[PDB]
Point group: D2
Chain length 370, copies 4
Amino acid sequence: KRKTGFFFDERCFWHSTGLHAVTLPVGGWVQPPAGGGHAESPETKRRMKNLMDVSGLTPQLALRSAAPASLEDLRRIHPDSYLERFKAISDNGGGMLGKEAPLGPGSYEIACLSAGLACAAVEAVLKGELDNAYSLSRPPGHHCLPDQSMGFCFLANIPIAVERAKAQLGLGKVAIIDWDVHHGNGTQHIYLQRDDVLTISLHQDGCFPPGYAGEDDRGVGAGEGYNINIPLLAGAGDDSWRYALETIVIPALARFEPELIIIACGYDANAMDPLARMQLHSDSFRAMTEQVQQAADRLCGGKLVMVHEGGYAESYVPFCGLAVMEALSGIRTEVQDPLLEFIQQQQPRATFAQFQRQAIDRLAQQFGLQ
Amino acid sequence: KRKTGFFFDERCFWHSTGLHAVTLPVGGWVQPPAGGGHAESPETKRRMKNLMDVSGLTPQLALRSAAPASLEDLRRIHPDSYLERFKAISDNGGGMLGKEAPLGPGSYEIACLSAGLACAAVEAVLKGELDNAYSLSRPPGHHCLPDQSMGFCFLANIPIAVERAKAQLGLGKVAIIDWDVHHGNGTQHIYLQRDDVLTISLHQDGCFPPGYAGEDDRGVGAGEGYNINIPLLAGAGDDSWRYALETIVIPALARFEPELIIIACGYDANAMDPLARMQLHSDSFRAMTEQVQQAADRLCGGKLVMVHEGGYAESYVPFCGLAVMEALSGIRTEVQDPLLEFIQQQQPRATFAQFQRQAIDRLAQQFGLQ
Amino acid sequence: KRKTGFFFDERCFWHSTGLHAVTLPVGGWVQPPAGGGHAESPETKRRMKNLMDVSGLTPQLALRSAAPASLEDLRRIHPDSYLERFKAISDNGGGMLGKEAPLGPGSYEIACLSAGLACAAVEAVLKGELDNAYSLSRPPGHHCLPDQSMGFCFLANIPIAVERAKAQLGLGKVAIIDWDVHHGNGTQHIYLQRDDVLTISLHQDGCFPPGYAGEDDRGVGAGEGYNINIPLLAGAGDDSWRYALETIVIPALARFEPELIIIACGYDANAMDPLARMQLHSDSFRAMTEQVQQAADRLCGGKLVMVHEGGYAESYVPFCGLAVMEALSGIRTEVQDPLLEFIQQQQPRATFAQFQRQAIDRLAQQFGLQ
Amino acid sequence: KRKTGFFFDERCFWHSTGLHAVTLPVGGWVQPPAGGGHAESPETKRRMKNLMDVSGLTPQLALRSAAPASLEDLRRIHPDSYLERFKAISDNGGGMLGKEAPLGPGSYEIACLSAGLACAAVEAVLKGELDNAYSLSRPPGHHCLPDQSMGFCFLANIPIAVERAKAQLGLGKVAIIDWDVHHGNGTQHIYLQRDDVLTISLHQDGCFPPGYAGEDDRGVGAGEGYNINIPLLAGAGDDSWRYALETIVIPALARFEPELIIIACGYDANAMDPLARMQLHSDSFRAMTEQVQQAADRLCGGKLVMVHEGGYAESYVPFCGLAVMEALSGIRTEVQDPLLEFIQQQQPRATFAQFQRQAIDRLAQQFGLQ
Ligand SMILES: O=C(CCCCCCC(=O)Nc1ccccc1)NO
Ligand SMILES: O=C(CCCCCCC(=O)Nc1ccccc1)NO
Ligand SMILES: O=C(CCCCCCC(=O)Nc1ccccc1)NO
Ligand SMILES: O=C(CCCCCCC(=O)Nc1ccccc1)NO
Ligand SMILES: [K+]
Ligand SMILES: [K+]
Ligand SMILES: [K+]
Ligand SMILES: [K+]
Ligand SMILES: [K+]
Ligand SMILES: [K+]
Ligand SMILES: [K+]
Ligand SMILES: [K+]
Ligand SMILES: [Zn+2]
Ligand SMILES: [Zn+2]
Ligand SMILES: [Zn+2]
Ligand SMILES: [Zn+2]
């Protein structure tokens, strides 16, 4: 039906972060790994693209790369002191950009590309050249603060793309919905005092950043009311995430009236993920994509951009990604998710489901949406 | 303080199960993995032993191997038709023992060793040669039915050891507590009609076998009252698992009065596990070990055996295993768990904790323990 | 300069062969591998394509896939009894097609694709739509006999493409030059009695098939004089391989006067290869490509097809492949081979070089070329 | 027959060197590896010990660890400026100790252990507590210069052990025979001016250090005549290496009359090694061990120590190591090398063999041994 862009570049798969045993740095009591290392591996993302190819989906999409984000683009978000230190470490062979921010040689130029893919996806959709678009942006962006890398993120991908669109393409109100299972603390910080961007994060209560829930953080000054955190309970599955979208996110969008919806699209709420404890399956992600595409249809002429964030289940993320691209493009391949029925049977029973529904009801009331 | 046995054999690390992408068999829509493959990898278990060595713990334990379980030992549990088919597949190069039971060449002899390590651990403790013991039994046992492999298990390790002890060492009542995060369906089936073994399983509601909770399954005929299932909510952490032990398991043991406690000790309730959604840390496992050691001290002269089951977080399981061996032996090394404080901060907040406490209270009432 | 085809398909990277420690099957005394497994891994070939992309070469080539080779195409070479057994094993989950021929689920359809890429490359060049072409055909073909898989090969890729071109496109004389470091025993067998195809193999003396040199095997009946084996000494490097091309292969082509040259292009003579003992570098492969392209220019209007075979050095093969594609297309990227100068310094000294030159001189005399 | 020490420590397997694709550092044109990384991996050495265990050999050996080499031990070879910089990099998380010397966190203490295992092996044999001994020393030592790391070596293991034995145990003349396939440039440098140690290196001509042969380097001043380099031709196999031992090494030992023979025992001349081009099999290494054990029996009361160096064929090195330990201890297990007959068939034919024999004859004449 739609003309759907897929923005990606081989170079994004070349970003490295040194030797880790899953998330632990090697040394001391942490033995080096015999096989695969850091959880933020290129394979998480490359396997999704590989499955899109063998499924026959890829040739029916508009495939694109992009020019890297320029220095000027980076500077709408990040000060030079941060950028220079990121680039120095990148240029000297890789190393640490403060605690638990490892990067590799040439990571700077690859992070600029990753942000440039997001910039170009936003631009194509805004200019009406595409109906909607997905950016396979690695490294991710949603934890990055202006002057601090965190949670495997080095540049604030979505804010860079948005700020560029506001400066060059007259973009007005935009909503950012972050269903990566971790809290989008970088996006929240950047837009905390602004009423022209609504930031919504669904996330696992207390997961990352650790110990953060955030429901009382609504924004400050002019931005008060324009930040929504939905801390879902660890263990929640398909029913809970879809109910939260239905009850909180879709009504919030209706009230705000954006001209563009952007999804920070992680898959780490999937049921086999080592970096969170949620129980989503590929049909969960397909249903959430349909819900936000339908909202985009009602509110901003169908303009929807999705930007890849997290997801660390190497065998399972591809099936979730494929589902999203199928829902986005309107094209169904012959692929059947081999774990779907298994994960459907593992879903929380009625007691938990109702408990979580009531917690979501209390949040919607607290946010003035019910 | 204690004389603690550690039973293990290099050959257990040589059991293989063919090519998988985590748990998915390769083929069709599942792309072959570039690095590590099946989640049930030798590294999950070998890294624990490696950390015990470098920590200085190993030389303070009684290290042992064992003779494999004999055919006669296997036949107290398993009929010959199953055993012959397992051995035929093992002897012909590996393959499938029905659906989703892959094994490799020589797996039969390695499964017999794994069960023999459990037999010998039970025997050493029963005969008073050791105070307590741990068996690093791979492949695991707690899903195996008499005539059906399941959940990476090929022989019923703990039942074989128990049935041998009943036949050769006059063992009477024994309690089996299974804190692997999946349901011990094999142990439950084998002892379902018996009052001489109490089987207790704490597990994630609906996880594996998928869609099974089990609270109403209490045993049949003479065995009614002697099976206890505790389906904990996905997402539960340290508070919940320890409260369930305190409120249900310790009182159940006090009522039953065993002569030996055996733990089916998996670590897959750890907070980084891809095969479940629980939030335990190394101190959770240390505290659960202390609770059951203390019960063994009160009830059966300190006689406690632990038998390794699951745990698939390759970087994290070693820290959990070390904690158990430290608590079992009474010796504290200088190792500090580098994720402990991180996972403590991710723990469910009070709302969930109280909800899960009330669910556990309802189970204890239903089981006549409150 | 040229219009160069690059024929490849994502599905070729999905062929698997079960669990191996490099080339050894697991079991018995062979411990399962912790990381990567069979040497014939998709990464050997995928890393070459990945480097072509990041170098900027790929968009300057004519990229294509192909229809799989049909049953009729396969049957010009292979009898049905072989084909049916290959397909049965493929369809039943993978397994063994006799000794040391492991394949995986769906390998049949992927081998048909691999052969179809070669068919299409030959066709495009023959019809004048491309000047020259490379096929990234995996699994490889040059060891496959009509009724027997061997050396990781399941279908005879190049013979299938040639026989199809003879039947459908009026192809006459064709020369096949095989510089994979192992002997092309499948190609040699298929064309042994034919004067319409000249098969030339440069290979490591005695490497694979093991213990075979082959210099006295010249062909039989009408085919006598139309098979040339050049068993080079283990340890030989750039000087030796280029001298053999210069002294034996180029004059043999001049005498035969082909209408098309096909290269069976392996990279396993590279200096870091675990499956042979030769000392070639990326400039060796670039120089050999230039030599055969120049011959094609003199003899058959520039018509040259290259078909990927072997090469198992995962970090080094990409640099060798890139060099070939640069020489084939006439386009030089900015990539500099980081091991080039190192391997140049390891090359055999003058004593060995002259010894090997004299051995090549004796062969050229024996073949009537000097 | 013999009482054979095997000195090893789990901690030696914990030394890491960052992210590499085989030997290439990641970055620039080198894509990060999906699976295993640096060729100098713990698995090369751990798989040998694992096979010794499952073969039943290990319990028949004298197993030992050791105290790390002290600062005083290190300072007999290395100046403080080098040692302090090695330790600073080790203590700060790992990094580079000049070009192509990557090390990891804590590598300093693990290198001191590796050297301490060699010290203790030499001591046990010298004091008559063992007949002979093997040290599984990782990281290796034979390339290390006093003030420069090279070729994966950080401390000069064998020189440290020898210099300590000369200072504390009255050791006189000692011969060091290095059959690692690369040149022992560190040992050669350290003893170049000394007549109390004879250093002999068999190595692949020009391999590592690259472009070095060394036959004319015989020693300087008092040390002239006490260094022997044997640059064997790339491609050489069992016949050549054993003939060189027979014709050059055994007569050189007979002339020098040592009180102790030490072997720098690498396995990287094995026929599947990516880091050299030789064709040895497990029986080659067994025969070389017998030759030097027999010399030790004739010359120095059977006193032989072997110290692990290189070997990077992960599936094959274990079989070669097992063979050495079988020959050293006098105990034959039931293990049969599954590649033995294959590699026997790949061996160079008579033409090459005789050529290499004549080259060895010329060296023996040049060294005054024929
Ligand atoms: O996917 C992400 C990043 C999530 C990071 C979660 C795990 C972080 C971690 O493991 N932290 C840690 C590591 C070592 C020591 C202490 C904390 N964001 O969307
Ligand atoms: O650790 C265990 C075994 C748990 C197994 C859980 C995952 C099983 C799985 O992934 N099942 C599956 C695979 C392919 C297709 C459908 C189901 N028991 O303690
Ligand atoms: O690259 C190839 C295939 C070469 C195969 C060489 C190694 C074969 C092997 O390792 N054989 C073997 C394995 C196990 C036992 C005995 C032989 N052809 O071009
Ligand atoms: O095993 C050893 C060490 C041998 C090292 C051989 C390979 C070195 C290498 O690959 N060098 C290189 C890497 C990158 C760029 C240039 C040279 N010694 O016994
Ligand atoms: K989120
Ligand atoms: K805002
Ligand atoms: K359980
Ligand atoms: K019971
Ligand atoms: K060849
Ligand atoms: K012919
Ligand atoms: K040497
Ligand atoms: K000397
Ligand atoms: Zn995330
Ligand atoms: Zn489990
Ligand atoms: Zn080959
Ligand atoms: Zn070496």
